[PDB]
């Protein structure tokens, strides 16, 4: 028969396994599936590790999540249409669960699907090549359980390796003279490390917002944030100041674009991440900034130069889990032969049409509605349940307004599931005081 390689057992890889299992449960013949995962367990970014830099086997540490991390959007926006919160938890819960609670939810679905046996854990993909004549990809991997490098062939490769793990780490004048810790958001683990310290966060997106907020919540003496161009602009607490871009640092002091200065103990670069695919030749290698519409990906998925090489989840994310499902189901239907792809020139013209719309977006609302409309297109093409994109959009709108209202209070609010209609119930403790991050303490 035919063979599919899946790189990664995070949400996207797991969605891809779930897609095939769902078809198989309803009598479809499916390919052989091999999912290569470098970590010891599934969950991707949702799997926490204390490790930083490089893991015990010498691979770059994948994990960017930190202690005390909670859902940064309404859980109702990322609900699986085919495995509801009601089915998983059997009661209502808060709209903004800690990492461990959503990890439990993600695992719950693939536990139920019985797909764990497709996965080869502790295995890092090292190289991918393609042979024109056989139409096969050769995938070379290192099995760290046995310290052995091996290669197998596959008809399709689905790259679900993520793009929020390889840091974008810009130098600033004087980092080599500064006496405090300099790290990337990717290396941030326990905010208690910065208790009673004066912290600088460099950046103006979610990592800056949230890492700064954890430092606040867990007793940092002061937060300073700085932006390259656009301030985050929220009303910050008393001990937080937002400044224009860092110019330089000396042994202990940071100097900003406006000529102001601050004594700081540590610098956290919240400067985003790179799409980094060291295991790909240029012929297969997506090169893009973090955005809603990278080019060369037909339906945001199929590599236009070789559409038997697929990318999942490589867009920037408003939607997340149910976008990955939408992608995984479309990918599956194409691999099964149910949906055929057009010719390259047509794929290129359509990708460019999406790009032109992408380039016009200005407002947050335009941006999540763009991605909503992309997902609507995918879900209409397959048997993934066509859920209510418009109502999810309205939830995202409400969340944005909650964050404006109170950047430290938005996680206390409650939203209705668009899959089941059940309202989320208030959490037992306000976010700011909910110091314990465990699944036990939350439930």
Ligand X SMILES: NC(=O)c1ccc[n+]([C@@H]2O[C@H](COP(=O)([O-])OP(=O)(O)OC[C@H]3O[C@@H](n4cnc5c(N)ncnc54)[C@H](OP(=O)(O)O)[C@@H]3O)[C@@H](O)[C@H]2O)c1
Binding residues for FAD: 12, 37, 39, 45-46, 62, 72, 125, 320
Q: Is the dihedral of CA 15, 100, 51, 321 positive or negative?
A: positive
Annotated binding site for NADP(+): 70, 168, 204-205, 207, 228, 290, 411
Interface with Mg ion by CB under 5 A: which range of 210-218, 245-253, 285-293, 413-421? 285-293
Expressed in angstroms, the distance from the first to the final Cα of the chain is: 45
Do 46 and 99 touch, CB atoms closer than 8 A? yes
* Residue 5 phi, psi dihedral angles, 5° rounding: -95, 130
Nearer to ligand FAD, 265 or 325 (CB): 325
CB of 334 to a copy of itself, least distance (A): 27
Instruction: Select from ligand X, a copy of itself, Mg ion, none the partner in contact with residue 149, using the beta carbon and a kind-dependent cut-off of 5 to 8 Å.
Output: a copy of itself
Which of 92, 47, 84 has its CA nearest to residue 69?
47
Find the Cα–Cα–Cα–Cα dihedral 105, 111, 117, 118, rounded to 10°. Answer: -50
Interface with a copy of itself by CB under 8 A: which range of 10-18, 95-103, 190-198, 429-437? 190-198
Helix (H) or strand (E) holding 442: helix 439-442
Q: Show contacts of 135-143: CB within 8 Å, 24+ apart.
A: 135/308, 137/5, 137/308, 137/309, 139/5, 139/36, 141/36, 142/57
Task: Report the alpha-carbon distance of residue 330 to residue 111 in Å, rounded.
Answer: 22
Size of the site for a copy of itself (CB under 8 A): 48
Taking the CA of residue 229 as centre, how many other CA atoms within 13 Å lie in the half-sphere pointing to its CB? Answer: 0
Nearer to ligand X, 165 or 382 (CB): 165
Task: Report the alpha-carbon distance of residue 436 to residue 439 in Å, rounded.
Answer: 9
Task: Report the alpha-carbon distance of residue 342 to residue 350 in Å, rounded.
Answer: 10
Task: Report the alpha-carbon distance of residue 324 to residue 49 in Å, rounded.
Answer: 23
Task: Rule CB under 8 A: say whether 126 interacts with a copy of itself.
Answer: yes
Instruction: Select from ligand FAD, ligand X, a copy of itself, none the partner in contact with residue 287, using the beta carbon and a kind-dependent cut-off of 5 to 8 Å.
Output: a copy of itself
Task: Report the alpha-carbon distance of residue 191 to residue 219 in Å, rounded.
Answer: 8
Task: Rule CB under 8 A: say whether 296 interacts with a copy of itself.
Answer: no
Instruction: Select from Mg ion, ligand FAD, ligand X, none the partner in contact with residue 279, using the beta carbon and a kind-dependent cut-off of 5 to 8 Å.
Output: ligand FAD
CB of 385 to ligand FAD, least distance (A): 19
Q: Is the dihedral of CA 426, 66, 55, 45 positive or negative?
A: positive
Which of positions 250-269 make contact with a copy of itself (CB under 8 A)? Answer: 251
Residues at the interface with ligand X (CB under 6 A): 69, 72, 164, 168, 170, 185, 202-207, 210, 228-230, 270-272, 290, 317
Instruction: Select from ligand X, Mg ion, ligand FAD, none the partner in contact with residue 169, using the beta carbon and a kind-dependent cut-off of 5 to 8 Å.
Output: none
Nearer to ligand FAD, 207 or 222 (CB): 207
Instruction: Select from a copy of itself, ligand FAD, Mg ion, none the partner in contact with residue 219, using the beta carbon and a kind-dependent cut-off of 5 to 8 Å.
Output: none
Contacting residues for 111 by C-beta, under 8 A, at least 6 apart: none
Do 266 and 197 touch, CB atoms closer than 8 A? yes
Instruction: Select from ligand FAD, ligand X, Mg ion, none the partner in contact with residue 179, using the beta carbon and a kind-dependent cut-off of 5 to 8 Å.
Output: none
CB of 53 to ligand X, least distance (A): 15
Nearer to ligand FAD, 180 or 313 (CB): 313
Residues at the interface with ligand FAD (CB under 6 A): 7-13, 36-39, 44-46, 62, 64-65, 71-73, 78, 124-125, 160-162, 164-165, 279, 313, 317, 320
| Ramachandran class of 166: left when φ > 0, alpha when ψ lies in -120 to 50, beta otherwise | beta
Task: Report the alpha-carbon distance of residue 150 to residue 370 in Å, rounded.
Answer: 42
Our CA angle for 114, 4, 64, nearest 5°, is: 70
Q: Which of 261, 285, 291, 400 binds a copy of itself (CB under 8 A)?
A: 285
Sheet holding 3-7, edge to edge: 119-120, 32-36, 3-7, 156-159, 309-311, 302-303, 297-298
Which of positions 51-90 make contact with a copy of itself (CB under 8 A)? Answer: 51-56, 58, 60-61
Annotated binding site: 12, 37, 39, 45-46, 62, 70, 72, 125, 168, 204-205, 207, 228, 290, 320, 411
CB of 51 to ligand FAD, least distance (A): 12
Nearer to ligand FAD, 21 or 317 (CB): 317
The residues that touch a copy of itself, with contacts defined as CB under 8 A, are 48-56, 58, 60-61, 126-127, 142, 147-149, 166-167, 169-171, 175-176, 178-184, 186-187, 189-190, 192-193, 195, 251, 274, 276, 278, 280-282, 285, 287
């Amino acid at each position: 028969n035919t063979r599919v390689a899946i790189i990664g057992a995070g949400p996207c890889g797991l969605a891809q396994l779930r897609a095939f299992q769902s078809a198989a449960a309803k009598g479809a013949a499916i390919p052989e599936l091999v999912c290569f995962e470098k970590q010891s367990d599934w969950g991707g970014m949702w799997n926490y590790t204390w490790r930083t830099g490089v893991d015990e086997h010498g691979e770059p540490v994948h994990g960017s999540m930190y202690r005390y991390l909670w859902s940064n959007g309404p859980k109702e926006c990322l609900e699986f249409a085919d495995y509801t919160f009601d089915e998983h938890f059997g009661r209502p819960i808060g709209s903004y669960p800690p990492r461990e609670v959503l990890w439990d939810y993600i695992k719950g679905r693939v536990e139920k699907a019985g797909v764990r046996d497709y996965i080869r854990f502790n295995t890092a993909v090292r190289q991918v090549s393609y042979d024109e004549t056989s139409g096969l990809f050769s995938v070379t991997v290192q099995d760290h359980s046995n310290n052995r490098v091996y290669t197998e062939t596959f008809d399709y490769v689905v790259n679900a390796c993520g793009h929020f793990s390889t840091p974008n780490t810009p130098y600033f004048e004087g980092f080599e003279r500064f006496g405090g810790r300099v790290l990337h958001a990717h290396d941030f683990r326990d905010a208690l490390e910065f208790k009673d310290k004066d912290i600088l966060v460099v950046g103006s997106s979610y990592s800056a917002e949230d890492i700064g907020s954890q430092c606040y919540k867990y007793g940092a003496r002061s937060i300073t944030s700085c932006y390259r161009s656009a301030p985050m602009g929220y009303q910050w607490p008393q001990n937080w100041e937002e400044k224009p871009l860092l110019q330089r640092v000396d042994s202990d002091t940071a100097w900003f674009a406006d000529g102001s200065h601050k004594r700081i103990d540590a610098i956290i670069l919240c400067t985003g991440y790179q799409h980094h695919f060291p295991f790909l030749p240029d012929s297969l290698r997506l090169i893009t900034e973090n955005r809603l519409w990278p080019l060369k990906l037909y339906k945001g998925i199929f590599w236009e130069d070789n559409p038997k090489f697929l990318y999942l989840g490589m867009q920037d994310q408003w939607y997340s889990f149910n976008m990955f499902d939408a992608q995984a189901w479309y990918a599956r239907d194409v691999i099964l032969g149910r949906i055929s792809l057009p010719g390259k020139a047509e794929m290129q013209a359509e990708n460019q049409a999406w790009r032109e719309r992408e380039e016009k977006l200005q407002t947050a609302q335009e941006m999540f509605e763009f991605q909503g409309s992309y997902i609507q297109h995918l879900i209409d093409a397959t048997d993934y349940p066509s859920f209510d994109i418009q109502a999810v959009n309205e939830t995202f709108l409400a969340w944005k307004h909650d964050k404006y209202e109170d950047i430290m209070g938005y996680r206390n609010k409650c939203y209705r599931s668009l899959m089941t209609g059940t309202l989320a119930t208030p959490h037992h403790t306000p976010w700011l005081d909910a110091l314990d991050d465990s699944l036990e303490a939350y439930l």
